[PDB]
């Protein structure tokens, strides 16, 4: 069991945790209870692993897609906010955190990938994936490249795979059917085949990850990248003149990225459910709290209505939502963890030439 009289929080390292830590400081000056913020690596996997030993945080921060597994494993406490509080957040954001008819975390913000480009190197970004190979060879003649993004996580390549037919679990009757997986249909094979061709023709590099892609774009070495709102702060300090726009189309169809809702859950083994509930509702989910976190690393479109009216006026926010409107909200069923394991393995194997596209997508067994 975690110690009583203190709140331990887990949040990913790419988010503005220093801003969240400041929000925890205002909490202690009012209540006298310290708040510690940590960013462990692969925290979305360590939480169900360390739960049996009594460790883990009091509050866990992650996108909504992995919270159904935590609930089915019996690791989350059911939240109970009154009707007046639920009216403060958008209705659809509460749906993302509803599992088996119960609320299992507090929604925070909406995330979606966008296209980021260098205005000086590229005044008009391309509208289609198909013209990127021709644009790369023209930029290579100047010592630059067209596009670099994190190929090690299937979150970043899924928009192209799902562009012409790929999907995770079929949704129907208000429920997901785990026996209907759409990872190896004709559209998914076409999307991944196009990605592999870019690497084979030396337009991209199979070993590119998050840090390499972020450094190349921020240092003016590549013209385009794909990332989320949290990455905007690092581009600002590099004074690069950048834009945020819709992703290019593939075979005439738009890219369909998976939309995530950042959420905060409460540990079932925690004796501080009392304080964690008040911290989330009346200190973080306010105009002051969300702004302290957003000004560290942007959160995206927040779930709190009385703040989104301000953030919506940002063109970068409008671009995030237009990609989100063309995509779909991730499922929250427990099988999503096994889904991401199979898809991550298939993309890496195909991108490195160890398997063909037909072999990798057939090998992705999630049911």
């Amino acid at each position, epitope marked *: 069991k975690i110690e009583e009289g203190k709140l331990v929080i887990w949040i990913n390292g790419d988010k503005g945790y220093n801003g969240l830590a400041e929000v925890g400081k205002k909490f202690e000056k009012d209540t006298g209870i310290k708040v510690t913020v940590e960013h462990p690596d692969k925290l979305e*996997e360590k939480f*169900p*692993q360390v739960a*049996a*030993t009594g460790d883990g945080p009091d509050i866990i921060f992650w996108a909504h897609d992995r919270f159904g*597994g935590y609930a*089915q*494993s019996g690791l989350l406490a059911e939240i109970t906010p009154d009707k007046a509080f639920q009216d403060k957040l958008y209705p659809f954001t509460w749906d993302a955190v509803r599992y088996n008819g119960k609320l299992i975390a507090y929604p925070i913000a909406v995330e979606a990938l966008s296209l980021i480009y260098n205005k000086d190197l590229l005044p008009n970004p391309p509208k289609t994936w198909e013209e990127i190979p021709a644009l790369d060879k023209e930029l290579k003649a100047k010592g630059k490249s067209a596009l670099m993004f994190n190929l090690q996580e299937p979150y970043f390549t899924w928009p192209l795979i799902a562009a012409d037919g790929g999907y995770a679990f079929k949704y129907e009757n208000g429920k997901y059917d785990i026996k209907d997986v759409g990872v190896d249909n004709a559209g998914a094979k076409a999307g991944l085949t196009f990605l592999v061709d870019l690497i084979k023709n030396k337009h991209m590099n199979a070993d590119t990850d998050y840090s390499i892609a972020e450094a190349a774009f921020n240092k003016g070495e590549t013209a385009m990248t794909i990332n989320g709102p949290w990455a905007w702060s690092n581009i600002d300090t590099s004074k690069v003149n950048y834009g945020v726009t819709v992703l290019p189309t593939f075979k005439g169809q738009p890219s369909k990225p998976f939309v995530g809702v950042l959420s905060a859950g409460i540990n079932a083994a925690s004796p501080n459910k009392e304080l964690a509930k008040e911290f989330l509702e009346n200190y973080l989910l306010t105009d002051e709290g969300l702004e302290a976190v957003n000004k560290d690393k942007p959160l995206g479109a927040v779930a709190l209505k009385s703040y989104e009216e301000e953030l919506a006026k940002d063109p970068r926010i409008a671009a995030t939502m237009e990609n989100a409107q063309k995509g779909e909200i991730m499922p929250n069923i*427990p*099988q999503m*963890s*096994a889904f991401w*394991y*199979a898809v991550r*393995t298939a993309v890496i*194997n195909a991108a490195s030439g*160890r*398997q*063909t596209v037909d*072999e990798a997508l*057939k*090998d*992705a*067994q*999630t*049911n």
Partner: antibody
Amino acid sequence: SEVQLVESGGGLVQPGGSLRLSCAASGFNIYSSSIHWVRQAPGKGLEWVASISSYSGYTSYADSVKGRFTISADTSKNTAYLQMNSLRAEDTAVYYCARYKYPYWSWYYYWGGMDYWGQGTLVTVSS
Amino acid sequence: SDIQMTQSPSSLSASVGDRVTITCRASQSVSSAVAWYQQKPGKAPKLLIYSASSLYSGVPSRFSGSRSGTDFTLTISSLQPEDFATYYCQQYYYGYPITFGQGTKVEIKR
């Protein structure tokens, strides 16, 4: 070194007899892990028998031992057991107990394999 | 609830310092839920690789795992005297029971 498993309970019995094996753990807690039983006949390969996961209340058995073997765990003394009833001559083998580091859930199957094994105990079923 | 694990070759002879590669094939798709073990005569198995290519702590970096088509592969880049033993593959995808391969013997060549 600090994590180890010590088995006990093997011997020779008649066809139809019973035996009970033990697997005592040190360096970790069985209640927060998974224990497996794997057997090996002289000069052959490995075959999985049974599995238990205390924290998730999960048990599983191989088809060749269903209705005859029973796996259980005593958390208060950090020991797992394998009750073997209706033994046949073809059950003669060395029996191992191995650890899976975390509790078991079907949607979390991908966390790895068996990282620690015991020394084993010999079981002979003959008339 | 049926699956078969087949290893090739069943035996190979090599010298200290050689590079060696063993292959394993499953009769059903199981993603990369395959592990590799080492066993010497009179001793219990020892875990080397899991998730097809993740090296377990303490295993020297001269071991490595990868994929070749649908097959699983295990490679020892610089064979050492302690590396001579029998190697097994094992699948643990939740849709099929835990199943081992028939093993592969690595003997010293003289």
